[PDB]
Structure formats: structure tokens, C-alpha cells
Amino acid sequence: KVKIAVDRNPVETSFEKWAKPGHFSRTLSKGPNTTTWIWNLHADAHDFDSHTSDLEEISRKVFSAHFGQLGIIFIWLSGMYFHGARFSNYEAWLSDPTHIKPSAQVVWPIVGQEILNGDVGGGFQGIQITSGFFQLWRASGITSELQLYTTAIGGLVMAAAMFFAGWFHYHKAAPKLEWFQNVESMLNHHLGGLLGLGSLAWAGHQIHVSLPVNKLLDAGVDPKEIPLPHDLLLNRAIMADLYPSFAKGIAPFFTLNWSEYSDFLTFKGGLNPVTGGLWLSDTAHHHVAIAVLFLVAGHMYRTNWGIGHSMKEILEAHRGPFTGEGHVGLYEILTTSWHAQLAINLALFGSLSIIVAHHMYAMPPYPYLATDYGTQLSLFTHHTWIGGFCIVGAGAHAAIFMVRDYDPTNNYNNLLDRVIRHRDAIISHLNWVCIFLGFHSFGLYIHNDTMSALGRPQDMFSDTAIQLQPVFAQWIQNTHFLAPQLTAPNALAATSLTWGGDLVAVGGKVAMMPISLGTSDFMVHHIHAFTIHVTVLILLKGVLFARSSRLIPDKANLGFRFPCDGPGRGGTCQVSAWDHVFLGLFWMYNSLSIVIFHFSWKMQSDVWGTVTASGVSHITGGNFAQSANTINGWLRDFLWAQSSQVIQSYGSALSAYGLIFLGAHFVWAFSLMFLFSGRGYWQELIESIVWAHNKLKVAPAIQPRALSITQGRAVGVAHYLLGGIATTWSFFLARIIS
Amino acid sequence: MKDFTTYLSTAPVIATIWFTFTAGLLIEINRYFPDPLVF
Amino acid sequence: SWAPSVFVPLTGLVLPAIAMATLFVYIEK
Amino acid sequence: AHIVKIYDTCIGCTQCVRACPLDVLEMVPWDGCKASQMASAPRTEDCVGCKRCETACPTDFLSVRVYLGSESTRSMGLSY
Amino acid sequence: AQVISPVNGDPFVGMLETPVTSAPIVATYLSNLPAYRTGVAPVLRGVEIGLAHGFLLAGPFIKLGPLRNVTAEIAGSLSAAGLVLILALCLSIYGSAQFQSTPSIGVKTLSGRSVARDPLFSADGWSEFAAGFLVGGEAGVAWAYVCTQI
Amino acid sequence: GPKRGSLVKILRPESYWFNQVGKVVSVDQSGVRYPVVVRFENQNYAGVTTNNYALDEVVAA
Amino acid sequence: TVPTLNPDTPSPIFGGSTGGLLRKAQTEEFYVITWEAKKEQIFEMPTGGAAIMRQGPNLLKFGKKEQCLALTTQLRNKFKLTPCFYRVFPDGKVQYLHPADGVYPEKVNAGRVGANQNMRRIGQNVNPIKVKFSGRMMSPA
Amino acid sequence: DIAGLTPCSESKAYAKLEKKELKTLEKRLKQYEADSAPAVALKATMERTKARFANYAKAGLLCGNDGLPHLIADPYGHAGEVFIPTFGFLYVAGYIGYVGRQYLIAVKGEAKPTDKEIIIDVPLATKLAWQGAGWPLAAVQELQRGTLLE
Ligand SMILES: CC1=C(/C=C/C(C)=C/C=C/C(C)=C/C=C/C=C(C)/C=C/C=C(C)/C=C/C2=C(C)CCCC2(C)C)C(C)(C)CCC1
Ligand SMILES: CC1=C(/C=C/C(C)=C/C=C/C(C)=C\C=C\C=C(C)\C=C\C=C(C)\C=C\C2=C(C)CCCC2(C)C)C(C)(C)CCC1
Ligand SMILES: CC1=C(C/C=C(\C)CCC[C@H](C)CCC[C@H](C)CCCC(C)C)C(=O)c2ccccc2C1=O
């Protein structure tokens, strides 16, 4: 009987616990003796599982926490709109896209910062944005700032509502464990209402607002002169005139004469030649189909009527010879452990954000997106990152489940058991495959560097000398361009020009063109696949042995987060699952960093540039295929040559990127102090300094203590990532903008 | 509100209500007296 | 070309070959 | 193997025996302390040197000390 | 019935007997190979193993080498004859350290009866293998360039 | 021994509270060596607020 | 009082894991654990895996004494049982280990004289110039 | 002058650094109308930037062969460059430090002092804040009195 279950007024709402830091744990509530206290209370702030054993209280905490998050995000979205309304060039940008640089930030005039307000066009002085909002706005049919203001105020209200919601569903009406466990209902409602009705109603916006307004703009008519989007609704005469099938109304819909809607619901593909973005008509039909798919999909699982599948039944059904009892027991786990769910969800979200980057790379869905190289590089790099992080996080929490929630006695599961029983083979094989991959990828580059140094170019791995052709990839590319003829007849052009031909260009710039694949590409992909396999090695090893190993059989009792178990057994540094996540972050950074470098060099050399007399001049003149085969080529043709614009960014609008360039190196290097050292030194240092304080009667009551080993590692990895990422960030953006 | 004020007199809150003050002060003085290398 | 044709590959291989051989036997035995 | 010693500052709170993963220490009667008992290390050939014992000691300064010494197959935590 | 089971009855031994490891076949093929045979003297095993690698090393140094674009198979010939002679140093030096007093193997069979111990591991054992790896290797190398060349 | 609750300086050099002040909790009247049980306001590294000391390793000041 | 006899009794249910025995058990010293489990209830394999206990006498096979004292403390704390455990050698000999004198080491038992027990404060150690010209260390004086 | 370096009031390079910076902004200002918003900024910056150069020429700093004003850090042509500011710091730093001293000591005797490092007694601190105005007169008197050192 799936039903609404709630506790009434479980927690009073006075500031009695605000004024008591570390209320949430009996340990911290006692107060600080040492400075370590300060760290601990922030470390364990959101760690609800260690606070209480009650799954109810945890469950109430988690989403109210999520209502708070959503409030924050709305406020963030509110921000962008408002600035896009108040402090921007958008209207100027809604009249000559080609010759205005998108800007939605102004600096105040003090302290020389004025120079950051650069010559961005439309008679406006400011910071060029690379978020890609201006194109979203054109895609949504936004024409005037007023509209942006109104959207902003709405987001602020929504922020208020989400904050209210979060206080409410903890302090007045907190749902019961039973509630949260209605997985079938949750799944159905999220699939059908959220995604389904979401893309359906959106598709409503697209068919009634986006499509018409876009055609008039692409026609060239002044945006001020364009009819307002409500008058499109009440005067369909304008819609009839733009697409004829509106004359027949919703009659063709009910009568199944859908072919009459071929005016605005297309399958053409390729790019809109006047704008370098996907057809909005393709997108409208995309969302229409997707809405139906999700809507019917969201009616799979059993709720308050006999009809529908039960998750536990499907799970208990699915067993075979090699696995024994199979999926049995998994439902119960995945209805009692937030960690396990978090682990799943982070892996697939993360994977999703990376596929989003690519698919946005290959199929620019917004107007004048493709030709704003700054925006395109920013978005692909960004989304590639957040994915990166989320995937490592999936590994982290998987291990946390493995240590804190796994209990075979109470909640048995055999798939898991069988995995545990042969972990050694898995990890050893991953080890092997990784050494393989490392040698046969890096080794190729070292081989090339050596042959190139020894004067033997004919012996190199390159299109000229050695051929390592991506035959499969070329096949699939072959199949993709020929598909509109044979296997997808109703489709006019290809999904993407990076498979097909037809080089489409806007404003003298290349929007998209066929991407050639040679030996250099063979190289970098196998480097990737190496990096991913190593990251998986570290993280999987971390999760599978989180509980026990040959060295430390009782690791499970010691925790998820802990430094070591001493210098015994020869020495046991970095045994914990946390330490695996630790090292996993570095390799992830490594992998992701070569990807975006791959992306940037690839794009500037083989794709992007200007279009002259029946011909193309690329930004870096197709050096990739010949230069990216050696380490020296990256060192010189990518790093050294490209860093030019960042290193001389001084005295300009882009100088902030030079400052951040240096600052990010600083902070990166600064991490190494924490990573390379240990708190034994620091604590003795602190002993001497404390002496000095006491000598002058200026010693603190909160006894000054060096960071824990774990915190040293966390600070280390954090500053390492922030430094690295911020440096690449200042690099690309100054580079691609200039 | 004895409780609410103790929170406002917590370390991270005071620091922030102190730094926005001594930041403004230094931005302010750099406005009406711009670009100093003496005094 | 007389001397360095002999002394380079002997110092390159034949010195480390019997060094890695006779030092291995010193370690394990 | 590693050396493990117990000094006379021992209170005999027994945490160091109860903490050990390889059973090196034991409690013996004595005449020095309020608890009438003291810690002892008769099995140091099985000692790994992981220093849980030390971490467990309440005395100031610690009344167990582990001096990492000559290393044998057991002290190196080997199962292979 | 479970496809995968404990190791020869014992479930507390570090292994899992899959249809990959233990089966009607695999237990018959691996015993057919030179090294795993128990009853044979230590001379003939090393030749049957040693020869084989002389052909696995032979193909390689012909077509990928520096003189691949030309003495291409004379080049590839004695280079396969080399990893042979080094293995012989590796296997003679491997032997020099290990065996001081008597052999050391899992004495019994799967049936469990105390079968005679193999000379695979002994003082006079690895010598005739190290010899087999030489005479097999050096001669076995020659026949990948009497057939591809001569 | 010292009177209960008296402020006492530590003179054992290897202590975390060496040359520092503590209060006497109870001096055990027996044949024990370290009878003077002292408790301090500030903990050591090992999360301990209290220790045992001998009669020559305290000075009431 | 007498140390345990070393009989043949059946090990508890287990599909098998890779974490278990290796070459060390064959040519070095492996380890054996003994206890009387009341009912059939599941336990954590310290070398990885789920495994069901059987009623009556149960014995396990491990290659390190940590894998015993991780399990024993997991058998002693959770189920509240009491296991004995001892070594094995590859010629067929045994070394009785735990509990060595029937009593577990944490609570006091007569007839266990003190070993490696220094009878001074640690700072009353001599400086390591006064232990050169020897094979001695800093604590044993 | 001092270290042979020219005074900024006279020097050529310094006066040519004026020109270059101004004539960078006048190449921008062309691309906008005079009534416009950014033109009032590119005029105001110029006015400020041209005022700035004038106000070092009036200050009388030493400018080198570089064209940049260098500083003097010992004695009396250029007191105000370092010698005066220097005291400024040691005061306000001494202010901050001594307030912080008087806070920690003022708490010290109150059962649990650690609470006052976190939930800071604001109306204690804001009284010590003003008291810390006359700190060198107290700091000296405390060094005299002999309560300053442990
Ligand atoms: C961006 C943003 C925003 C905005 C938003 C918006 C503006 C939205 C809208 C939305 C909407 C406005 C939606 C709508 C929806 C709708 C729907 C969902 C409908 C449905 C329907 C149905 C389902 C039906 C069915 C039926 C019937 C009943 C009858 C006949 C038959 C049929 C079956 C057809 C805000 C400010 C918030 C914030 C910030 C961000
Ligand atoms: C003049 C000049 C100069 C020089 C200088 C010199 C040469 C100096 C020296 C100095 C010295 C030789 C010093 C000494 C000192 C000592 C001592 C001994 C100190 C002490 C201190 C203290 C004790 C402090 C305290 C406090 C206070 C007062 C407040 C705050 C808090 C505290 C606590 C920190 C130059 C050229 C550079 C520049 C120009 C000018
Ligand atoms: C330097 C260093 C330290 C010592 C560094 C410390 C303790 C960092 C923290 C210092 C900051 C400045 C303390 C925070 C102070 C508060 C923010 C309050 C300051 C008051 C106002 C100025 C805001 C370690 O603890 C450590 C541990 C493990 C490996 C490496 C290292 C390591 O390298």
C-alpha cells in the first residue's frame, strides 16, 4: 500500500543548537581542547551515518539537504539571468552575433581593475563570458532583457520555495522510512513526471516560442520588430504563415495525420547553415519522441494496483550457473543504504556528463555555438571535468558502503560474495593489462622521441613512416555518412559533419568539418584507455579490499577514513580506502588533462580556422598529425607555442588570466609541501613556536596542533587539483579568446 | 535571541563581519586617495 | 674505429652481463 | 624480530594487551601499582611492530615501547 | 549443479577450480606439454621447450628491424639465437642460486598417493634444462632461416 | 604526600606537562611508587587529561 | 592445565576464495583455529568472502596469525564464543599458542613471569655513546 | 642624484611612459562616441592615469634609466617613501597583536577559556579594541613593570 507517511513536528526550530558547534556528535559537543577540533567539526559536518544509527533521521536529513542544494542552485541560475538582463551586451548580441563578443560581467572602476573591461563590442566595456548563456537565450527565443529580469525574479522565488520546502520537510512534516522506500513509485514518477512531462512541456516551449522566433531572427528581421511570443499564441495567423500545418490545428494530431506536421517536426540533421547549430525542428521532434518514450517507461513498476513489476521479483529471478544465487538480496541493500545508491548514481551521472561534453562537441545544439570557440572549449572541458570528479566519487562511496553497510549475516548477497572470493584475479589482471597498456602507449612516444633524436624519421610511428591506422573507427565513420542513404532513409543529412562531408561555415569561421583520423589519434586514444584503466585499478582495488587484505585482515574495523596501522608489517602507509580515492584523484586528473589537451590541439589544428578563396586556413595549420607523435611535439608545438598569448596577456583585458596562470602554479606547487611531508616535523616546529608564545603570555587555550595525516593528504590533493585545473583554465581561455 | 547573538558572535561569522569592514576601509581609502606609493 | 668498435660493446654488455651475473650469485646463495 | 618492552610506569589498565593483533603481551601480577598488575612481552618473535599497543597506552610517557629491529618472515606480515 | 566448486574438495586453499582451470580437457593438454611430464629424464624436456622459443623469436627480428628496408633475415637470424644464449645465462644463473640440498615439489597427484618427486627442481635438474634451452634454442633458431631464406 | 586539590608543578622531564601545573586528585596511601594522581586542564597528544607521578616528581607551588 | 588435543573435525561451509593458502603453507608454517559454534550463523572471512559456520567443532586453515586474531576477536566480540588456535609445520609437528596458559592474555593468570620488563622510567635510559663497541641497544640496561 | 638615478619630475623615459599609456587609451576611445558610457571611463582613467604621473613628479621620487620610480630606504630627501610608513605598520600590527594579547589573558582565568576563542565575547573584545589604541605606552610600562615575560 504505497501511501503518504509523515511524522508531525519532530524537531523544534529555535537557534539553541546553532549556538552549539559540533552538537551533532557526542565527542565534538564537549568542545575543543586542541585546534584539531576545528577541522573535525567541518570534516564530519555532513557525515550523518556516524552521527546516528537511525535510518529515519538520516533519510530526513538527506533530501532536506537536497532542498537546500536546489535552493542554492536556483539562486545561482537567478544570478546569471539577472546579470544577463542588467550587465550584458545581449541585445547588441541579438543583432550581430558574428561581430560581438558575449559579455555579462562588468568591473567597478578602482585599483586599475578597469583594464579588465575589454573591447567586447556593441558599445559596451567588459569581461567576455564563455558560459554559453547567450546562445541558450537565443534558443529559448529570448529577445529582450526584461524577459531575463522576469526569469531571474522567478528563480529567486523558486529559491525561497526550495528553502521553505527543506525547512518544512524536516521541522514540520518529515516523511517516514516507509515513505523513502517506495522505490517503484519514486522511479515511475521521476521517469514519467520529471523527465517525461519535462521534455514534453519544454517541447511545448520549443514548438510555440523557439521555432517561430528563431526563423524570423535567422530571416534577419530586427529583434525589436519581431512579434512577442504570447501574440504567437493568440494570433496563430503568424504561425500559419510561418508553417502551414497550424491551419488544421490539433486535428491532424488526433486523426493520426502527423505527416502534415512535417513543417516543424523534421529529421533533417546536419547544421542550420545560417547559424551553425542543429535545427530547432529536429530538437522539437526529438523532445516530443523522448517525452512519449519516458512517459510510457514510467508505467513499468507496481504501486497501488496489482499491475506492474516488483523490483525484488525481477532481481530474484535473474540467476544462473557461474554466479550461483545471482541478484538475490540486492533490493534489500539498495533500499537500506544511501551509500550504495550514491555509488551507482555518481558513476552513471559522471559518465553522462562526459557523453554530454562529446555530444555537445560533435552536435552543437544552440545557435552560433560552434563558431564561439571560447564557449565550445570551455563547455567541453568543464563538463569533461565534473564527470571526472563524479566518477571518482562513485568509487569513494562504493568503498564507504563496503566498509560501513555490508553485513552478510543480516543482508546477504552472493554476486558480492563471489566478487570478494576472486578479487585477487581481478586486481592482478587489471595490473597486467595496465602495464601492457602503459608500455604500448607511452613506450610508443618514447620510441618516437628516440628515433626522432637519432635521425631516423622513416622508423617513427607516423602517417609518413609507420602506419597505425584506426581502421575500425574509419569503418564506423564510413557507415555513419552512408547511413542517411541506406539504414536511415528519412534522414536528410548526417547527424554530424565530423562523420559526413558538407563543411558548414558561419561568418567566415568554420562551424564544423570532417575530422581526419590518423596515427597520432591512434596514439592518444590508447593513452586515454591506459589512464582510465589505471584509475579503475586504484579505485576498484580500493573498494574491493576496503574491508580486509592479506596485510590487514581487520581493516574493516579501522574505518573508511584513517591514515595507517603503523610502521609494522614492514610499514603500512596508505592502506585505507580513502587513500585509494586519494591516489585515484591524481590519475583521474592525469587522464582528464590529456583528453582536454587532446581536444584543444585537435580542434585548433585539424578543424578550426578561417575560410578563404574556396579553401581553409586552420588555426595551427594541421601540425597535429605530424607533431603529436612525440613528447617534444607536445612540449613545443602545443605547450610552448600556445602559452604565448597567456604569457603576454599583461596590460590587456586578459591580464587576469596571466595572474591566475601564475597563481595556479603557486597553489599547485604549494600542495607539494603537504604531500611530500609529515606532521611529525610540523608538530615539533609548533612546539618551538608555542614556546615563543608562552614566553610572552600569548599562548592559546585551544592547543595548536598540526593537521592529521589524512587532512595533510586532503589539503595536498585539493591544492594539487585546484592549482592544476586553474592553470589549464587560465591557459585555454586567454589562448582561445585571443 | 541570546542564542541567535552567540551564533552571530561565532568565530567564522565575526571574521567575515570584520573582514568586509577592513576590506571596504582599504577599497574606500583607495577610491578618494587613488594610487599611493607615498603616505 | 679500431679501439671503440671493441671497447664500447664490451663496456655496454659484457661488463654489466657478468657483473649482474656474479653479483646476483653473491646476493641469493 | 622487533623488540617490545614494558616500563615500570605501567598502571595495568590492560589496553595494550587487548589492542594487540598478534598476541605478544600479557598481564602478570606485580607489587608496584594500584591495579596490582603489570604488562609483559614474552612473544616478540610474533611481534609485527604495528604500534597499536603504544597508541593504546594511557601513561605519560608511554610505558610500552616498540623498537623496530631485525626483521623476520612473521614480523613482515607475510602470508606467502 | 554449480559449474565452479572448491579445489579438489578443500575449500580453504587459495584457488577456485573453474572450467577454465580444471576440466576433462586442459588437464590432458598441459600434461602433453614437455615441462609438466613427471616420469621422463631431465634432458629431453629442455630441448622441446628451448627449440620452440627459437621460432617465436625468429619471425620478429626480420620484418620490423632497421634492415627491414633493404641483410634483413641474416639480421633477424642470430638475434633470435641471442635471447636463447642469455636465457641460458638467466637459467644457469637462476640454477646457480636455488638448489643446494635435494628437491621441493607437491609430492602427490590429484589422486593423493605419494608419487616419486620430479627432477624439474634439483642440483642436476635445471642444468640439463639450461643445456636443452641452449642446444634447442641455437639449432631451433637456424631452421627459421633455412626455410624463410635458404 | 600533597594535600588533595593543591596546585603542583611537574618535575618529570619526559612528561607532556613538564614544568607545567596540575591539581592532585588523590595520593594513594600504600606501597605504590607513583601514588600522586594529577589531573590537568589541557590534554596531551594521546587524548589524556590525567597521569600518575612519584613524590619527588611533584612540587606544590 | 592441559593444552588442546589436535583432532580431525569438519570446516564450516565455504564456496572458496583466492585470499587463502599458497606456497608458504607447503614449505613454511601455516595456522589452524578450533572452536565449538552452537548454531549455524555467518562470519566475515578475514582473507575475503562470506562463509556459514556449522554446529559442533569447526577448524579453519590460515597462513598468518593476524588472520586468526582478527577472526578470534570477531568470533569473541560478535557471537560471544571462545576459540583456541595453534600453528602447524610441514613435517607434521604442531605448536600450541592461544590461549597459551588457558587464560587469555588481558586478564591475569599465575605462572607467567615478566619478560622484556625494564624497571625504570624511559628518560632514566643511558645515552647511546655508552652503548657503542658491542651488539647491544639503548633499553636493555 | 642618489645612486646617480634621475628625479621623476625631470626624467625623459618617465615622461615618455606618461605618453605611451595615455596614447594606448586614446587609440581605444576613437572606437566610441563622446556622449557614450565607456568614453566617460576611458576619459576618467586617462584623467586619473595622467593625474597619477603628475602626483609622483610633485612627490619627487627617483626614476631610473628604466623610466620607473625606485625607492630609498635608509635616512633626508626621501623620508616618506619607507621611513614614515614603516612606523605606521609597527603601530597597527602592534595594535592588533597587543589587543589579541589582552583578549587571551583576559579570558585565561574563566573555567573554560577555549569557548571564548570560538564564541568570542564581542563586548569584551570591542572594549580591548579601543584600549589597544595607546598600546606602546602600555607595552613599554608592562616591559618596565615586569609582567610581560614568563
Ligand atoms: C528556466 C527557469 C525558470 C522558468 C521556468 C519556466 C518558465 C517553466 C514553465 C513550465 C511550464 C509552464 C510547464 C507546463 C507543463 C504542462 C504539462 C506537463 C501539461 C500536461 C498535459 C497533459 C499530460 C495532458 C494529457 C491529456 C489530457 C488531460 C486530455 C487529452 C488527452 C491527453 C492524454 C493529451 C524559473 C523562473 C522557474 C527558475 C529559473 C530557471
Ligand atoms: C631603522 C630602520 C632600519 C633598520 C632597522 C634595524 C637595524 C632594526 C633592528 C632591530 C632589532 C635589533 C630588533 C630587536 C628586537 C628584539 C626583541 C627581543 C623583540 C621583542 C618583541 C616583543 C617582546 C613583542 C611583544 C608584543 C608586543 C609589544 C605587541 C604585540 C604582541 C607581542 C606579544 C608580540 C632599516 C634600514 C631596515 C629601514 C629604515 C629604518
Ligand atoms: C605546513 C604543514 C603543516 C602545518 C600547517 C598548518 C597547521 C596549516 C594551518 C594554518 C592556518 C593558517 C591556520 C588557520 C587559522 C584560522 C583561519 C584563524 C586565523 C586568524 C585570522 C588571520 C583569520 C601540517 O600540519 C602538515 C601536516 C601533514 C603534512 C604536511 C603538513 C605541512 O606541510
Instruction: Give the integer Cα–Cα distance in Å for D48 and D31.
Output: 30
Between CA A34 and CA A44, with CA A38 as vertex, the angle to 5 degrees is: 120
* Lookup: cell for D39: 604488562
Q: How far apart are CA F21 and CA G88, in angstroms?
A: 55
Interchain proximity F46–D32, CB inside 8 Å: no
Q: What angle do CA H138, H141, H144 make, to 5 degrees?
A: 150
Cα separations in angstroms, A699 against C23, H61, H128: 59, 44, 18
Query: How many alpha carbons fall within 13 Å on the CB side of residue D43?
Result: 21
- Tell me whether residue A170 is annotated as binding: no
CA angle A57, A400, A429 (to 5 degrees): 155
CB proximity A548 to D under 8 Å? no
d(CA E71, CA E62): 9
CB A159 within 8 A of CB A75: yes
Q: What is the chain A residue with the closest CA to E13? A: A421
Residue linked to cell 519516458? A294
Preceding-residue numbers of gaps in chain C (C–N over 2.5 Å): none
Strand A124-128: give its sheet, edge to edge.
A103-105, A124-128, A118-121
The amino acid sitting at G68 is C
C-alpha E27, offset from chain centre: 17
Residue A717 is part of which domain span?
Answer: 1-738
A vs F, Cβ pairs < 8 A, gives 8
Beta strands (DSSP E) in A202-360 are: none
First to last CA, chain F: 14
Closest by CA position to G66, among listed A544, D1, D77: D77
Decide the pairing of beta strands G31-37 and G84-87.
antiparallel
Are the CB atoms for D79 and G67 separated by under 8 Å? Answer: yes
Euclidean distance between the first and the last CA atom of chain E, given in angstroms as a whole number: 58
Q: Rounded distance, CA B20 to CA A735, Å?
A: 34
**Contact residues on chain G for F14, CB-CB shorter than 8 A:** 121-123
Beta strand pairing status for F50-53 and G42-44? unpaired
* Residue nearest atom 5 in ligand 2 by C-alpha distance: H74
Determine if residue A574 is left, alpha or beta; phi over 0 gives left, psi from -120 to 50 gives alpha, anything else beta.
left
The domain ranges of chain H are 1-150
F27 neighbors F37 (Cβ within 8 angstroms): yes
Domain count, chain A: 1
Q: How far from the centroid of its chain's Cα atoms is residue A399's Cα? A: 22
The closest ligand to the CA of A674 turns out to be: 3
List residues near ligand 2 (CB under 6 A).
A 696, 698; H 73-74, 82-83, 86, 94, 97-98, 101, 139
Put simply, whether D8 touches G (Cβ < 8 Å) is: yes
Cβ partners under 8 Å of residue A292, min gap 6? A196
This structure's resolution (Å) is: 3.4
Residue A509 pairs with which residues in a beta bridge?
A: A506, A610
CA atoms within 13 A on the CB side of A562: 16
Q: Does A429 touch chain G (CB under 8 A)?
A: no
- Point out which residues pair with D4 in neighbouring strands: D66
Among A603, A80, A605, A626, CA closest to A358: A603
**From edge to edge, which strands make up the β-sheet containing H62-63?**
H6-7, H62-63, H69-70
Task: Decide: helix, strand or coil at residue A7.
Answer: strand
Whole-number Å distance between alpha carbons of G119 and G141:
10
Pull the grid cell for residue D47: 611481534
* Helix axes A577-602 and A709-737, enclosed angle (nearest 10): 10
**End-to-end CA distance of chain C, in Å?**
42
Q: What is the spatial distance between Cα G125 and Cα E72, in angstroms, rounded to a whole number?
A: 75
Q: Which ligand number lies closest to the CA of residue A671?
A: 3
- Per 3-state DSSP, chain E is made up of helix, strand and coil in percentages (nearest 5) of 45, 5, 50
Interface of C with E in 8-27 (CB under 8 A): 17, 21, 24-25
Cβ partners under 8 Å of residue E112, min gap 6 = none
Quote the CA–CA distance of A210 and F34 in Å, as a whole number. 86
Beta strands at A173-175 and H62-63: parallel, antiparallel or unpaired: unpaired
Torsion of the alpha carbons at D69, D70, D76 and D80, rounded to the nearest 10: -170
A430 CB-near residues (< 8 Å, 6+ apart): A533, A536, A537, A540, A541
Ligand 1 pocket member A155 (CB < 6 A): yes
Residue A383 cell numbers, joined = 563538463
Helix or strand run (H / E) with residue A175: strand A173-175
DSSP state of A564: B
Widest Cα–Cα separation across chain F: 30
d(CA A250, CA A260): 11
- Cα–Cα distance measured from residue H115 to residue A360, given in angstroms and rounded to the nearest whole number: 53
Find cell 519535462 and name the residue.
A198
Kindly give the distance from the C-alpha atom of residue A137 to the centroid of ligand 1, in angstroms, as a whole number. 19
Max distance between CA atoms of chain A, in angstroms, equals: 93
Q: Give binding residues of D for [4Fe-4S] cluster as ranges.
A: 10, 13, 16, 20, 47, 50, 53, 57
Beta-bridge partners for H62:
H7, H70
Total count of residues recorded for chain H = 150
C-alpha distance from residue E41 to each of E38, E47, G134 (Å): 9, 12, 53
Which ligand is located closest to the Cα atom of residue A677? 3
CA A594/CA B9 separation, integer angstroms = 48
> In terms of residue numbers, what domain contains B19?
1-39
Task: Give the list of residues 6+ apart from residue B24 with CB closer than 8 angstroms, or none.
Answer: none
* Cβ–Cβ contact G20 with A under 8 A: no
Question: Do G108 and D17 lie within an 8 Å CB cutoff?
Answer: no
Alpha helix positions (H), chain F: none
Buried b / exposed e along A465-488 (16+ C-beta atoms within 10 A): bbebeeeeeeeebeebbebbeeee
Q: Which distant-in-sequence residues (6+ apart) come within 8 Å of A141 by Cβ?
A: A205, A209, A210, A212, A213, A214, A229
Nearest Cβ partner for B3 among A15, A21, A111: A15
Q: What is the CATH number of the domain that holds A296?
A: 1.20.1130.10
Label residue H87 exposed, middle or buried (CB < 10 Å: 0-12, 13-18, 19+): exposed
Domain count, chain B: 1
Q: How far is the CA of A690 from the centre of ligand 2 (A)?
A: 20
D68 closest CB neighbour out of A550, A567, A572: A567
Q: Are G105 and D27 in contact (CB under 8 A)?
A: yes
Q: Which residues in E lie closer than 8 A to residue G20 (C-beta atoms)?
A: 12-15
**SS3 of chain A: helix, strand, coil, percent, to 5:** 60, 5, 35
What contacts 24+ positions apart, CB below 8 Å, involve A673-682? A674/A707, A674/A712, A674/A713, A674/A715, A674/A716, A674/A719, A675/A712, A675/A713, A675/A716, A675/A717, A675/A720, A677/A712, A678/A709, A678/A712, A679/A706, A679/A707, A679/A708, A679/A709, A679/A712, A682/A706, A682/A707
- Assess whether the previous peptide bond of D61 is cis (omega < 30° from 0): yes
Task: Identify all chain G residues contacting F13, using CB atoms and an 8 Å cutoff.
Answer: 123
Residue A712: name the closest of A680, A666, A667, A688 by CA.
A680
Rounded CA-CA distance G13/F31 in Å is 56
Task: Give the torsion sign (CA, A599, A605, A606, A611).
Answer: positive
Asked if A117 and H41 come within 8 Å (Cβ–Cβ), the reply is: yes
Identify which of H89, H101, H144 to mutate to test ligand 2's pocket (most ligand atoms within 8 A of the CB): H101
- The set of chains that have 3 or more CB pairs under 8 A with H is A, B
Touch test D–C: 3 Cβ pairs or more under 8 Å: no
Cis previous bond, G99, omega within 30: yes
Question: On the CB side of A139, how many CA atoms lie within 13 Å of its CA?
Answer: 23
Cross-chain Cβ contact A566/D51 below 8 Å: yes
How many angstroms separate the CA atoms of H128 and A115, rounded?
A: 42
Reduced to 3 states (helix: H, G, I; strand: E, B; else coil), residue A234 is helix
Whether the CB-CB separation of A498 and A364 falls below 8 Å is answered with: no
Q: Tell me the chain A residues in contact with residue G45 when contact means C-beta distances shorter than 8 Å.
A: 420, 548
Q: Is A325 on the interface with D (CB under 8 A)?
A: no
CB distance D29 to D37 below 8 Å: yes
Output phi, psi for G84, to 5 deg: -90, 155
Q: Is A105 helix (H, G, I), strand (E, B) or coil?
A: strand
**CB spacing of A18 vs B3 below 8 angstroms:** yes
The single-letter DSSP state of residue C29 is -
The chain F residue lying nearest D32, using CA atoms, is F32
How many helices (H) does chain A have, and how many strands (E)? 31, 9
Phi, psi of E60 (to 5 degrees): -40, -65
**A509 SS3 class:** strand
Structural domain of residue G58, as residue ranges?
1-141
Domain-wise residue ranges, chain D: 1-80
Q: Which residues pair with A220 in a beta bridge?
A: none
Q: What is the CATH number of the domain that holds B39?
A: 1.20.5.510
**Residue G77: CATH number of its domain:** 3.30.1470.10
What is the identity of the amino acid at A657? Y
- Report how far residue A488's alpha carbon sits from residue A324's, in angstroms, rounded to the nearest whole number: 43
**Element housing A534 (H / E):** helix A519-544
Distance D54 CA to ligand 3 centre (A): 27
Determine the Cα–Cα distance for residues A250 and F45; give it in Å rounded to an integer: 77
Set of cell numbers at residue A14: 529555535
Is the minimum distance from the CB of A198 to ligand 1 under 6 angstroms? no
- C-alpha R_g of chain F: 11
Resolved by: X-ray
State the Cα–Cα distance between residues A545 and A538, nearest whole angstrom: 11
On whether any CB of chain F is under 8 Å from the CB of A652, the answer is: no
* DSSP code per residue over E55-106: HHTTTHHHHSSGGG----HHHHHHHHHHHHHHHHHHHHHHHHHH-SSS--S-
Q: List the grid coordinates of E41.
A: 629424464
**Ligand 1 within 6 A of A158 CB?**
yes
Q: B1 is written with which cell numbers?
A: 535571541
The alpha-carbon radius of gyration of chain H (Å, integer) is 25
Distance from the alpha carbon of residue A294 to the mean position of ligand 1, in angstroms? 15
Residue entry with cell 544570478: A79
Q: Count CB neighbours of C11 within 10 A.
A: 11
